[PDB]
Design a protein around this ligand. Structure first.
Ligand SMILES: OC[C@H]1O[C@@H](S[C@@H]2O[C@H](CO)[C@H](O)[C@H](n3cc(-c4cccc(F)c4)nn3)[C@H]2O)[C@H](O)[C@@H](n2cc(-c3cccc(F)c3)nn2)[C@H]1O
Ligand SMILES: [Cl-]
Length: 137
């Protein structure tokens, strides 16, 4: 698939929706981003950074009216340059639950509460994208 990739989420997200993204991190990758969008707002930005001041960190945030909010940072970093990955995002009633390569990684509490209006997922960054799909569990 071509990156950046936009995956429509028809009728928005709902609890029990599972989104699965398969791809490979490019060699010498700098960043990856998943952006769950509510119009111009970003309800959930998931942003692995491979070199922020020589550290590897995952930054999560929300953008409202073009302003970023308080960052939530995770030091556990399961991505590896050059290697294949699987990201699974499970929508639960009160948070997005993210697993990478079948291991739980983090939860992100819903800041944008109109879940039905979060109707696009943007996938960008330094990856080769193999598949992006959803199902109900
Ligand atoms: O919040 C999420 C956003 O972050 C800013 S960078 C942000 O800039 C701020 C200044 O305005 C702060 O410096 C902030 N910061 C650092 C620290 C800190 C704390 C401790 C140590 C340490 F070093 C650093 N605390 N706060 C930065 O994270 C990115 O541009 C933005 N973004 C990313 C992308 C994007 C576009 C395309 C692909 C892609 F993967 C991402 N498109 N917009 C998005 O990811
Ligand atoms: Cl809202």
């Amino acid at each position: 698939l071509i990156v950046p990739y936009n995956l429509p989420l028809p009728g928005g997200v709902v609890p029990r929706m599972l989104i699965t993204i398969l791809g490979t991190v490019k060699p010498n990758a700098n960043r990856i981003a998943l952006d769950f969008q509510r119009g111009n707002d970003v309800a959930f930005h998931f942003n692995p950074r491979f070199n922020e001041n020589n550290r590897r960190v995952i930054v999560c945030n929300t953008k409202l009216d073009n302003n970023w909010g308080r960052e939530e940072r995770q030091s556990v970093f399961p991505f590896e340059s050059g290697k294949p990955f699987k990201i699974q995002v499970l929508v639960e009633p009160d948070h997005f639950k993210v697993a990478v390569n079948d291991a739980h990684l983090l939860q992100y509490n819903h800041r944008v509460k109109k879940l039905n209006e979060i109707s696009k997922l943007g996938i960008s960054g330094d990856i080769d994208l193999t598949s992006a799909s959803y199902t109900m569990i």
